[PDB]
Design a protein around this ligand. Structure first.
Ligand SMILES: [Cl-]
Ligand SMILES: [Cl-]
Ligand SMILES: [Cl-]
Ligand SMILES: [Cl-]
Ligand code: NA
Ligand code: NA
Ligand code: NA
Ligand code: NA
Ligand code: NA
Ligand code: NA
Ligand code: NA
Ligand code: NA
Lengths: 133, 123, 133, 123
């Protein structure tokens, strides 16, 4: 039972929002939609194709580089390389003034299919996925 | 001490190389040293302060490779809706870490960009 | 008297930094360089051509969409349309959850020449301009 | 009161129109009303709350044009180095303001996107 603005696919409902939000703002927004949605997960080929068609069809969208989906690293360090190339492990880190690429996005130049890790605090358009009631 | 042209700090030998290579070519070059060696690793602030002292005279202020590659790879990626991350579809992209020849601050770069680098081995 | 990393043009020194900073972080960074630089101003055709050549020559750069320059609105309202289309002036505003496009950038798809107002809190590469000592 | 199909709030008449137009075409359409009218303006929160009450039954949840265009145009732009903003080279770009048919929150959009809209005139 999808609402106007949402597109059905495979028992879920999807909507690409042209508001530009941080990855956290986008997820929170999605949760506040209908009976509570999330940034889209992509769980298959078919769905990747669907989400990709959904975006490429949203006209406000735009010319837009990146589109958030629900991918986030968890993490737990602030970079994910556990060892230096000499086999030693990383204890001291100097990540002051460096932003992390721990949120996943779809990208215009790769047809909104391939996943790109990118900076979470960057504002972009996004896709919500919902299981209707 | 350390072979000529190299510098010791705390049981290890270091050399700067002002020669733009991509991360792999730079780590390659280190491995090719007569004593087999790697891109510098940092275990402390004081070791970083010593290495920038080395980089400064000739390399500063180029980006310099340190030995951390694929820094966004083995993160614990998940879906915000809790679905299993089973299906996957990532680019085709790798990041590596560098610092300027003048400060201790790290910088995430495309692994196929071209920087200077420092080699390091145990004495 | 330009330093290594800086390019001379017309008595000034320029450098495109591939670090991705907020417009405020970028300007602050620039001020902390040499005897104190700023995000680049573009004051002519020649200089626009120069800055544009400078970027298109920086290899890390990249494939990068936007490059901050020193353009900022001042402002003073949070949107710059003083009147509604009915001639009345704007007193109530609902800009909660809306980010402002009050910082100026050069853009890849327009040859790093034409100026684009864009969101200040977006992190990008940037160009500093310096008057050497 | 207000002509049939229009609604009054506080001496003014309002009508929603569910018909994607770009900002100019939408403001055009309002001007074309038998009583010449404009895209809705908001002078208070309570007027915004009344207009969304109107939009909801049929327009929700489309973006709806309000009467604010070129919102990034006449800003007091300056150079951070203090140079005179004499030479200029802007795109070729215009933004306009809209709200969703369901909340009072404004949204900046390209003026050539296509939304619904509300017309407004004085009674
Ligand atoms: Cl060399
Ligand atoms: Cl990586
Ligand atoms: Cl209609
Ligand atoms: Cl505008
Ligand atoms: Na299918
Ligand atoms: Na170890
Ligand atoms: Na020596
Ligand atoms: Na020595
Ligand atoms: Na010239
Ligand atoms: Na007025
Ligand atoms: Na009526
Ligand atoms: Na009425």
């Amino acid at each position: 039972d999808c609402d106007f603005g949402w597109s059905p696919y495979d028992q879920h409902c999807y909507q690409a929002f042209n508001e530009q939000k941080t990855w956290d703002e986008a997820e929170k927004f999605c949760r506040a939609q209908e009976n509570g949605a999330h940034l889209a997960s992509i769980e298959s080929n078919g769905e990747a194709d669907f989400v990709s068609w959904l975006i490429s069809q949203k006209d406000e969208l735009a010319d837009e580089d990146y589109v958030w989906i629900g991918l986030r690293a968890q993490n737990k360090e602030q970079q994910c390389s556990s060892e230096w190339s000499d086999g030693s492990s990383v204890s001291y880190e100097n990540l002051i003034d460096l932003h992390t690429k721990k949120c996943g996005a779809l990208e215009k130049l790769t047809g909104f299919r391939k996943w790109v890790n990118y900076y979470c605090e960057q504002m972009h358009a996004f896709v919500c996925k919902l299981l209707p009631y | 001490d350390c072979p000529s042209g190299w510098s010791s700090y705390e049981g290890h030998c270091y050399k700067p190389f002002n020669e733009p290579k991509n991360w792999a070519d730079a780590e390659r070059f280190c491995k090719l040293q007569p004593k087999h060696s790697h891109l510098v690793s940092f275990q402390s602030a004081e070791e970083a302060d010593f290495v920038v002292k080395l980089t400064r005279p000739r390399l500063k202020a180029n980006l310099v490779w340190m030995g951390l590659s694929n820094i966004w790879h083995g993160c614990n990626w998940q879906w915000s809706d809790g679905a299993r991350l089973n299906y996957k579809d990532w680019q085709e992209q790798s990041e590596c870490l560098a610092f300027r020849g003048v400060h201790t601050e790290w910088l995430n770069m495309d692994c196929s960009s071209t920087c200077s680098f420092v080699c390091k081995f145990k004495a």
